């Protein structure tokens, strides 16, 4: 009943529908952030989004991230589970699925995020740490921190699946 789907703005209606439902969750959960800024990032084609979907197409949460495949890391820009979908497990399963996805479809081995105060606890639970060990030369300039959050890092294992 619950699907974890990766989408991005490739000009298709179904993808836009998911991106929009996700954007609305982020906008509601991060009200102090400029809503148009959130929209721009989610709809940016370079940004991918893993959405938690309940059939038919009900977005219950998700993560919008910016992968830098060549540098082996991705910035987790937005993360949230709908406040009306407080069923235990969604947040953890969403992160678990994203880790499995990037490890099997890319050369991404690290996650970096400027966590908002209220997300720090969740991220720690997902194995992220405030102790940044990824050299600044790798990510500096590639990720921004306009909200003054807390940089956190997750270091994952090397790529699994590879065909093309």
UniProtKB/Swiss-Prot annotation:
<comment type="function">
    <text>Histone acetyltransferase that acetylates histone H2B to form H2BK11ac and H2BK16ac, histone H3 to form H3K9ac, H3K14ac, H3K18ac, H3K23ac, H3K27ac and H3K36ac, with a lower preference histone H4 to form H4K8ac and H4K16ac, and contributes to H2A.Z acetylation. Acetylation of histones gives a specific tag for epigenetic transcription activation and elongation. Operates in concert with certain DNA-binding transcriptional activators such as GCN4 or HAP2/3/4. Its acetyltransferase activity seems to be dependent on the association in different multisubunit complexes.</text>
</comment>
<feature type="binding site">
    <location>
        <begin position="86"/>
        <end position="92"/>
    </location>
    <ligand>
        <name>acetyl-CoA</name>
    </ligand>
</feature>
<feature type="binding site">
    <location>
        <begin position="79"/>
        <end position="81"/>
    </location>
    <ligand>
        <name>acetyl-CoA</name>
    </ligand>
</feature>
<protein>
    <recommendedName>
        <fullName>Histone acetyltransferase GCN5</fullName>
    </recommendedName>
</protein>
<feature type="binding site">
    <location>
        <begin position="118"/>
        <end position="121"/>
    </location>
    <ligand>
        <name>acetyl-CoA</name>
    </ligand>
</feature>
<feature type="site" description="Important for catalytic activity">
    <location>
        <position position="75"/>
    </location>
</feature>
<feature type="active site" description="Proton donor/acceptor">
    <location>
        <position position="75"/>
    </location>
</feature>
<comment type="similarity">
    <text>Belongs to the acetyltransferase family. GCN5 subfamily.</text>
</comment>
<comment type="subunit">
    <text>Component of the 1.8 MDa SAGA (Spt-Ada-Gcn5 acetyltransferase) complex, which is composed of 19 subunits TRA1, SPT7, TAF5, NGG1/ADA3, SGF73, SPT20/ADA5, SPT8, TAF12, TAF6, HFI1/ADA1, UBP8, GCN5, ADA2, SPT3, SGF29, TAF10, TAF9, SGF11 and SUS1.</text>
</comment>
<feature type="domain" description="N-acetyltransferase">
    <location>
        <begin position="2"/>
        <end position="157"/>
    </location>
</feature>
